[PDB]
């Protein structure tokens, strides 16, 4: 294990940009036990694509509560389009901490419409539009669609109430 981090340090000193050394160093640190140094190495690699770098920093900032840094990493890791995925969520959750967020949670739903916590964060960012969304979701069994859309209609709703009654009848049967 020591040999592998020596060859990495050599391949850090010589090819000085060398992100794959540095990220590799971070991986070695993860294998090792000093997450403050591994994170620093990952940051250095970032300064110099790598999804494991982006997620180790972004997970560290996420649990430090620093959702602005985690959006920064994950926004750059998305918009460099060089090979990653999850970051989309941490952009949305940052923006939540409203109008700007409305865009990332609507896009998340267009990628997974039965994504519940995403329908929830969407509502919190935000009546007629909600009803339409419910129809789109209900149009594609699902009680909590029928319940949220109906509630939105009530806020704006007789049809929604009827739908709720039908759902109750179904539950009874």
């Amino acid at each position: 294990i020591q040999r592998y981090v020596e060859n990495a340090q050599n391949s850090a000193s010589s090819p000085r940009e060398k992100s794959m050394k540095g990220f590799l160093f971070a991986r070695l640190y993860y294998e090792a036990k000093e997450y403050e140094l591994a994170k620093r190495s990952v940051s250095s690699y970032i300064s110099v694509r790598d999804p494991k770098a982006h997620r180790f920093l972004g997970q560290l900032f996420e649990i430090e509560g620093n959702v602005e840094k985690a959006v920064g990493c994950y926004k750059r890791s998305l918009e460099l389009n060089p090979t990653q995925k999850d970051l989309t969520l941490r952009i949305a959750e940052l923006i939540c901490t409203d109008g700007r967020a409305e865009y990332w949670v609507e896009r998340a739903s267009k990628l997974f419409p039965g994504s519940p916590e995403i329908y929830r964060l969407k509502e919190q960012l935000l009546w007629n539009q909600l009803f339409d969304l419910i129809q789109a979701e209900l149009f594609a069994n699902d009680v909590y669609v029928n319940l949220k859309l109906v509630d939105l209609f009530l806020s704006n709703l007789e049809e929604a109430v009827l739908h709720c009654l039908k759902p109750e009848r179904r539950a009874l049967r």
Binding site: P15, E17, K18, S19, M20, R49
Partner: protein, 83 residues
Amino acid sequence: IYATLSGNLKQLLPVCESWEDTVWAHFKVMVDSLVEQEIRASIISFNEANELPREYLEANWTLDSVFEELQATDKKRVLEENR
């Protein structure tokens, strides 16, 4: 052959290059430039190996520009093979 290996064009031999043959040579330039740019971004290439950077096309064209440039004839007509 050396031009195809380097990811560059050739000249007299392309006079007898048909559409499929010209598509191949130009896509080969795109792959050979893209791989080298990813290798550079990853820090895989060593500075010493950069003997002639100025002589090589760093830029890559999109697949769309590949077809558009191939689609034109040398004499500014619609390519009969493309049409």
